[PDB]
Amino acid sequence: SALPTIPYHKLADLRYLSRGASGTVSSARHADWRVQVAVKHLERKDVLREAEILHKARFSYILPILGICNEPEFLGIVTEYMPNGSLNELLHRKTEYPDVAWPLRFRILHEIALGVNYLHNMTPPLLHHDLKTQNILLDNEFHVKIADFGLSKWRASIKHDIYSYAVITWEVLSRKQPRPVINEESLPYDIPHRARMISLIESGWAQNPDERPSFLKCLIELEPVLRTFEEITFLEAVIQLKKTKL
Amino acid sequence: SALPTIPYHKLADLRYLSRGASGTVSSARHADWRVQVAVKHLHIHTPLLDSERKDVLREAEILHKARFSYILPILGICNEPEFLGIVTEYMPNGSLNELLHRKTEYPDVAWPLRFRILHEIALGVNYLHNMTPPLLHHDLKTQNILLDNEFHVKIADFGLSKWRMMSLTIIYMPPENRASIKHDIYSYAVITWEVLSRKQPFENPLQIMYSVSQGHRPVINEESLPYDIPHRARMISLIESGWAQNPDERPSFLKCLIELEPVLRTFEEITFLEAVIQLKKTKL
Amino acid sequence: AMYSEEARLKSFQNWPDYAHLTPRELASAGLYYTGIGDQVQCFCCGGKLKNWEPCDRAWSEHRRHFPNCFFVLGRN
Ligand SMILES: [Zn+2]
């Protein structure tokens, strides 16, 4: 509803990016704009509802929708691109990725916490149920965007999302595919404020939903940790990463 | 097709930034969401006349209808009985107005980013005319264009933007003064020249009315136009076509993007990341 | 003294500005503030409530979590 509609002939450089659960993401350059948008397609009603949802929630930490492709031969949804890809490439592949700095992963966690906080702080609120490290999207400078709302249901509440945030926190501090054990080998003692993170991860995936953290409490207890760092390391660790790529 | 509203009790920490044409720019920290969120407001706790109420309502509606990743998104509004203010997202690094007009804070800014942000703004404005009927921003300047942490630039302040209909600073006017789409091209050219030059045009404004309309342009001098910057003549041609006297020959934004593309082919993202540090530390 | 609403109001001192529920709303809900953080509890059960839901009201969450309230039973 009230979203722009563009024809499929305005797309060029059809290149494969990823195959999402709710539909594949194609790296297709536009024609009038000439930018490698993330066209989503293969379900037609499902992707229409997806476009409606992305139009409903609009935050800088969610990739802004740009229009829809209403054509009989092919239906598509246009969003921005991802040059460095998702977190899966950053963490699960360490053969050529040598190291990832602590400030980067902590900033990623803070961004995810804020995004799902707002996602739970709408009128009426929303639940994700599809928050995974592969779903987290890194921009040109690794800022977090959240996509694939297919399992996001309009509204067990505030449980799957916070559990996903906890497991992804442990994942990006451990860089190991997944209850996960939190020993020193997985979580070395060099991590600043380590015991805080251990308490966080055990709280997040608690069996009892009653004690399950809310995202608001998560962000209000995590803020001093990101307060400890500075912008210099934030802007330098990405440079070190890119230099190590070549 | 619905824009959620924001109660005033949730928002906190109103901080003064500036006063624009469509409101008074301010920054705030949204307490409930734990997000720093900027705001703008014509008046504070005054009888809300229906004229400005309709103005801000249509502003919010047009911002919500067509949102681009290269324009600043809209968060919401406060429909208070006595106070009116637009709640929009806060990009931490701010805008280019002080960035391009503070020599002490920014003695030097690298030309790779200086041209890459031009690509971003060109993409945004080209999209802004792709939605039927084409939108004429009418107020696109260095203030409206604003950047986030990583200097990704977004435009805002659509308040005086007027949609094009077919039913047939005062120094920022184009020689056109009938709404013409080429005013966006003219604004893009002047901001393109302002980015690299870091010089404010019109530096008595009464003569500008008879000067810019007749054909006069801000002075061209070697100190502000040095040959050291590569592709200097290309951007000279781009701007001289941008602010032409009439809309017949000014290139479409696609043509300007195509012309600028070879200029931007001379950079790598590693250069951009290296160049953000110098600017981020010289402003300290 | 905790029965009096003024007692809850004065126990709601130093309440943080980021809370989504005004002390008056909690006092009407029959809750008080311990003084530490955002911990609140009702005089009927004593159950301590945390992890504020921004859109949920105190009455609704007290009813959902603890439907055995004598305060809610009188309210209903
Ligand atoms: Zn109770």
Numbering used by the authors:
A (entry chain B): 8 to 49, 59 to 171, 206 to 228, 247 to 314
B (entry chain A): 8 to 175, 189 to 197, 205 to 230, 234 to 314
C (entry chain C): 159 to 234
Copied sentences from the primary study:
RIPK2 is an essential adaptor for NOD signalling and its kinase domain is a drug target for NOD-related diseases, such as inflammatory bowel disease. XIAP binds to the kinase domain of RIPK2 through its BIR2 domain.
The XIAP BIR2 loop 209–214 makes electrostatic interactions with the C-lobe of Kinase_B, which comprises residues belonging to the αH-helix (E279, S282, and K285) and to the regulatory region (K209 and I208). No interaction is observed between the XIAP BIR2 domain and the kinase activation loop, which indicates that XIAP binding requires RIPK2 to be in dimeric and αC-helix IN conformation, but not necessarily phosphorylated on the activation loop.
